[PDB]
């Protein structure tokens, strides 16, 4: 489990309860929840292991954000809003859909103004519709003055020191995430370091280390769902994915003010708690440190993942067609390495 | 089959008969036997398909070679002589044995003078022993005057024009091969072009095109038996090697004066005819033409073989240990591409 639901100050009762969590097939153990001043927290980040930091004040000025405040102040830029008839918002790269014309995504992307997102959300709730929305938009220069001021008030002192201490590359973006209760982002890994800053509502985060690659079966690299797990967590096909019976997760529920370090290459499944209302999150994506000058053997799990990705990319290019990658790989192994 | 046994001139009867051929599980069709002046012969060489040329005179001065002549004239250099208790002289690279300390070769290499090879051969025949010898030695500068003169008398005019016409690289070596009746060199492919010049006795040659890679199951690249088939032709394991049930060979029996073009990457199984006496062959190995400037898609079979070899080599280097290549490849494919 995630650990006992945290009790809110002022005797406001349990923030959430276990009935708001979806049911899955695998065991988990809790991600540590620590103060940013705790040396164990620094130890985990340094070793690229997840930790929830409870007191960074990383996005303190954003803790007042709700739909009314954001709509008044976030400007008139476009926001990417995904729509689905399922709770699962499986990520896919539109640019790879040409490689797999048989892939029919279950979520669709629509660009709209922030007030149109609020209105569509309101229409759905009144009509009792089952349609789900998930706003996922990189923050940019079109935001209004008050959002600029809030953003400037993030704890750049703390996170800049992390970036420097860990040798990371640049901050590439901040993703603003606004979801409906019950929304799920299925398990995947990212090739950047991530500080995941919860603002409103509660998200259950289930992480898996890079050495569970064999259990989580990412799509082919050239598939639209590169880096995402092929396993349906709600109905796992153990005939196709037998080592999913061996997966073990690291679990936590983050609430307003919490920051989760999601290390590069770590798998993560994220869900907005059932009956928990809307959720708001801002993340901080950093490029990882460069390949070290001297390679130490045996390689770490994340280095083998990087190798496998590059083998798939190179074969797709050399064979001139990503569909020939599988057949060549099978020819290489059958009766030779298996 | 190989085609009707050729009838020798002067009414000397069939050179050989089908009872001298070993029995295998797969069908074959005959390699064309043509004159070097036949445009179809040039067409096959140009398209990297095998052909037996009957009238090249490529090694005409060597057709008088026997053990007595060679012993008198081939000098006092060392000759590599393989010894085995089986008819199969499976090739292996001594330099890769460190990677696979569990590999126990069934043939051993011993360096000796040519007269010691003749004497060991004579001891075996008198004592009725079952030990087999196979002399396999690159021709070099230590050979005596009469062998030098014979070698100078090869048809360099004809073969030099082939090398030039096909864009091949340099002649890298000439392998002298002297085997006992019944000796077999198991199926493998070479990364050079080969003109195979038969001098004494008869060899059955069974070739398989590069697109039968999937049926012939070469050892891992880092194994001592790189480029050789794992299938025991005398007892094929169809559970491990199911597509060996689909292999189809191109077959011929070469005799004195014949030259077989064995194209680069073509699999070949070579056997000295049962009860046929000793065999003598000299081959001519040429580096292949370079990779073309413009790549045409889809790739040819031999280009996919080159890619697979390089993937295995690169992974062995990057993982720091050739034993980790298999596990990484299986992790890449299981539940992802298979």
């Amino acid at each position: 489990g995630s650990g006992e639901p945290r009790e809110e100050a002022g005797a406001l009762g349990p923030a959430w309860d276990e009935s708001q969590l979806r049911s899955y097939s695998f065991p988990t153990r809790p991600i540590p929840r620590l103060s940013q001043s705790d040396p164990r927290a620094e130890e985990l980040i340094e070793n690229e292991e997840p930790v929830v930091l409870t007191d960074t004040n990383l996005v303190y000025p954003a803790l007042k954000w709700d739909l009314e405040y954001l709509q008044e102040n976030i400007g008139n830029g476009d926001f990417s809003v995904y729509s689905a008839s399922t709770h699962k918002f499986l990520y896919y790269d539109e640019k790879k859909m040409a490689n797999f014309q048989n892939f029919k995504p279950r979520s669709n992307r629509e660009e709209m103004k922030f007030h149109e997102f609020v209105e569509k959300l309101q229409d759905i709730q009144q009509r009792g519709g089952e349609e789900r929305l998930y706003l996922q938009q990189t923050l940019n220069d079109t935001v209004g003055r008050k959002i600029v001021m809030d953003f400037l008030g993030f704890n750049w002192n703390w996170i800049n020191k992390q970036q420097g201490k860990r040798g990371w590359g640049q901050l590439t973006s901040n993703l603003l995430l606004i979801g409906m209760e019950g929304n799920v982002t299925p398990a995947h890994y990212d090739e950047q370091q991530n500080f995941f800053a919860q603002i409103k509502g509660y998200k259950r985060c289930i992480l898996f280390p890079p050495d569970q690659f064999e259990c989580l079966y990412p799509y082919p690299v050239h598939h639209p769902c590169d880096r995402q797990s092929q396993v349906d967590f709600d109905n796992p096909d153990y005939e196709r994915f037998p080592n999913f019976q061996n997966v073990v997760g690291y679990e936590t529920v983050v609430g307003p003010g919490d920051v989760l370090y999601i290390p590069m290459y770590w798998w993560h499944h994220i869900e907005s708690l059932l009956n928990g209302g809307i959720t708001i999150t801002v993340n901080f994506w950093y490029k990882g440190a460069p390949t070290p000058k001297r390679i130490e053997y045996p390689l770490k799990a994340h280095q083998k993942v990087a190798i496998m990705r590059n083998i798939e990319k190179m074969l797709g290019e050399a064979l001139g067609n990503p569909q020939e990658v599988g057949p060549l790989l099978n020819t290489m192994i059958k009766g030779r390495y298996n | 089959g190989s085609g009707e046994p050729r009838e020798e001139a002067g009414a000397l009867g069939p050179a050989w008969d089908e009872s001298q051929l070993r029995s295998y599980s797969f069908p074959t069709r005959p390699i064309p036997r043509l004159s070097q002046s036949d445009p179809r012969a040039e067409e096959l060489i140009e398209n990297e398909e095998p052909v037996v040329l009957t009238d090249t005179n490529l090694v005409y001065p060597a057709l008088k070679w026997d053990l007595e002549y060679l012993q008198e004239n081939i000098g006092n250099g060392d000759f590599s002589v393989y010894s085995a208790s089986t008819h199969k002289f499976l090739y292996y690279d001594e330099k890769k044995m460190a990677n696979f300390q569990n590999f126990k070769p069934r043939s051993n290499r011993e360096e000796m003078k040519f007269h010691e090879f003749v004497e060991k051969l004579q001891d075996i025949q008198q004592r009725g022993g079952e030990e087999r010898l196979y002399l396999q030695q690159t021709l070099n500068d230590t050979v005596g005057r009469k062998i030098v003169m014979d070698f100078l008398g090869f048809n360099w005019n004809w073969i030099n024009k082939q090398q030039g016409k096909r864009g091949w690289g340099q002649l890298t070596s000439n392998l002298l091969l002297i085997g006992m009746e019944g000796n077999v060199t198991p199926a493998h492919y070479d990364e050079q072009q080969n003109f195979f010049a038969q001098i004494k006795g008869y060899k059955r040659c069974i070739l398989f095109p590069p697109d039968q890679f999937e049926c012939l199951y070469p050892y891992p690249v880092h194994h001592p038996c790189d480029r050789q088939s794992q299938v025991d032709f005398d007892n094929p394991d169809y559970e491990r090697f199911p597509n060996f049930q689909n292999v189809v060979g191109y077959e011929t029996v070469v005799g004195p004066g014949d030259v077989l073009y064995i194209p680069m990457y073509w699999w070949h199984h070579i056997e000295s005819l049962l009860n046929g006496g000793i065999t003598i062959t000299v081959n001519f190995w040429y580096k292949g033409a370079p990779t073309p400037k413009r790549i045409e898609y889809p790739l040819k079979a031999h280009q996919k073989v080159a890619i697979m070899r390089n993937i295995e080599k690169m992974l062995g280097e990057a993982l720091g240990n050739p034993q980790e290549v298999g596990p990484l490849l299986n992790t890449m494919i299981k539940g992802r591409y298979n």
Binding site: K95, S173, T185, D190, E191, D226, M264, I295, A306 | -
Partner: peptide, 18 residues
């Protein structure tokens, strides 16, 4: 060279490129 080639990380994340 080849080892560093195969070890090179990408930077892809779950955010759609335009």
């Amino acid at each position: 060279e080849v080892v560093k080639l195969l070890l090179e990380a990408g930077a892809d994340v779950n955010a759609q490129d335009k």
